[PDB]
Amino acid sequence: KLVRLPGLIDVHVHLREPGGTHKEDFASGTAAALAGGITMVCAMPNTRPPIIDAPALALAQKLAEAGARCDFALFLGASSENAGTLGTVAGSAAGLKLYLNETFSELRLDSVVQWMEHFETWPSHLPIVAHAEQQTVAAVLMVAQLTQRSVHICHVARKEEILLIKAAKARGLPVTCEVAPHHLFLSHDDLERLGPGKGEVRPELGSRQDVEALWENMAVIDCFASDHAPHTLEEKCGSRPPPGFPGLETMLPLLLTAVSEGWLSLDDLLQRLHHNPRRIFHLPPQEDTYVEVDLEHEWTIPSHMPFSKAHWTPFEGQKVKGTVRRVVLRGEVAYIDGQVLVPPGYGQDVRKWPQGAVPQLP
């Protein structure tokens, strides 16, 4: 007996096109998405060139429209130079992403005053999300209150962070957050197995106490999002390993295993992979779209999942219960039992749908 789920949404993926297509491209990454039961993705802007101006966004839109197999929205990225320049294209993006900790030079902000400038100039009705670790969570929350608007915290990974967000919500502050599967299912205990290269990720893997705190505070977690961050094994095992894990193909099997174990309910999962992503990012419904899963099938994650060009996974060897059997996207069979059946280019930019525009006052 298969269970029908709505089309799931991952609001945090890195699809590496343009400029890193040996790691992933729209076609391979959205294949990975569909195989993971994900029918809509929001793609981060730290590509090469990064999506920090209108020409780069225009290029990325065409690459995505030609390569994506599932539907998508594209983030714009904040830079030290583009505050106040994005007004005409802001509504066409998923939102604005701030890299407030480590990143490459083009996305680095050197002063909290630059964060303030972005919060002040980005249209107030559109989403802002932040990579903000440890005290940076408190700092960006302060900037949000000074400018009287909301903020969404990406990949919350620590007891410290979820408890700060919990306190902020108790005071009625408009903050939401997401958690990635590696911060719920991996910890320091796994670093010996993974090694120092494979294990590199930002936010880093937490302690067992961090993991337990995120589970205990599930009510504070608005979304799950993979932070699909593909790099090849050569790169992860080399002399300057880049941080990040691929995760699209493993995130739903891991969470379905947790559901089967009673760690959270099926509704808890669907709030965090469907309803709350929709409502935080104003993402439109997908007509005739659904995912059929088998909650009985037991399997062991292999050394690499079939589709991501990363060709490795930190979850190798984990026993899971739950698998994606079939995905229907806008009335076409998109995935069955390991076979992707929609071509590159089938996916669409949801921000161009009339129902995908963010409502605003005139």
Ligand X SMILES: O=C(O)c1[nH]c(=O)[nH]c(=O)c1F
Q: Letter for the amino acid at 139?
A: A
Cα separations (Å) of 145 from 20, 71, 141, 168, 205?
36, 33, 6, 11, 29
One symbol per residue from 88 to 127: x for binding Zn ion (CB under 5 A), - otherwise; what is it? ----------------------------------------
Site for ligand X, residues 156 to 215, rule: CB under 6 A: 201-202
E runs forming strands in 217-316: 223-224, 290-300
- In sequence order, which residues have a C-beta less than 8 Å from that of residue 130 and are 6 or more positions away? 97, 98, 100, 136, 140, 151, 152, 153, 154
DSSP string, 49-74: S-S-SHHHHHHHHHHHHHH-SSEEEE
**Locate tokens 């991952």: which residue?**
10
E runs forming strands in the chain: 3-6, 8-13, 38-43, 71-74, 76-77, 96-99, 128-131, 151-153, 175-179, 223-224, 290-300, 319-329, 332-336, 339-340
Q: Is 131 in the site for Zn ion (CB under 5 A)?
A: yes
Q: Is 270 in the site for a second copy (CB under 8 A)?
A: yes
Residue 68 in contact with residue 38, Cβ under 8 Å? Answer: no
Q: Which does 98 bind (CB under 5 to 8 A by kind): Zn ion, a second copy, ligand X, none?
A: none
Was 49 annotated as part of a binding site?
Answer: no
- Could you say which of 139, 266, 336, 341 contacts a second copy (CB under 8 A)? 266
Q: Which does 46 bind (CB under 5 to 8 A by kind): a second copy, Zn ion, ligand X, none?
A: ligand X
Closest among 233, 230, 274, 235 to 255, alpha carbons compared: 274
171 C-beta neighbours (distance < 10 Å), count:
8
Closest among 20, 11, 15, 22 to 68, alpha carbons compared: 15
Q: Which does 6 bind (CB under 5 to 8 A by kind): Zn ion, a second copy, ligand X, none?
A: a second copy
| Spatial distance between the Cα atoms of 269 and 61, rounded to a whole number of angstroms | 30
262 C-beta neighbours (distance < 10 Å), count:
7
Was 243 annotated as part of a binding site?
Answer: yes
One symbol per residue from 12 to 31: x for binding ligand X (CB under 6 A), - otherwise; what is it? --x-----------------
Minimal distance in Å, beta carbon 290 to Zn ion? 27
Pick between residue 102 and residue 287 the one whose CB is nearest to a second copy: 287
- Could you say which of 229, 280, 310, 327 contacts ligand X (CB under 6 A)? 229
Minimal distance in Å, beta carbon 42 to ligand X? 14
Pick between residue 46 and residue 250 the one whose CB is nearest to ligand X: 46
Minimal distance in Å, beta carbon 227 to ligand X? 7
3-state secondary structure at position 179: strand
Site for a second copy, residues 20 to 79, rule: CB under 8 A: none
- Could you say which of 49, 241, 285, 345 contacts a second copy (CB under 8 A)? 285
Q: Is 220 in the site for a second copy (CB under 8 A)?
A: yes
Would you put residue 84 in left (φ > 0), alpha (ψ -120 to 50) or beta?
left
Minimal distance in Å, beta carbon 180 to a second copy? 21
| Spatial distance between the Cα atoms of 190 and 15, rounded to a whole number of angstroms | 26
Active site residue 227: yes
Site for a second copy, residues 328 to 357, rule: CB under 8 A: 354-355, 357
Q: Is 108 in the site for ligand X (CB under 6 A)?
A: no
Residue 189 in contact with residue 248, Cβ under 8 Å? Answer: no
- Could you say which of 110, 111, 192, 219 contacts a second copy (CB under 8 A)? 219
Q: Which residues bind ligand X (CB under 6 A)?
A: 14, 46, 131, 201-202, 229, 242-244
Residues that bind a second copy (CB under 8 A): 1, 3-6, 125, 169-170, 172-174, 217-220, 259, 265-267, 270-271, 275-276, 278-279, 285, 287, 290, 295, 354-355, 357, 359-362
Which amino acids are annotated catalytic? 227
Binding residues: 12, 14, 16, 46, 97, 131, 154-155, 178, 202, 227, 231, 243
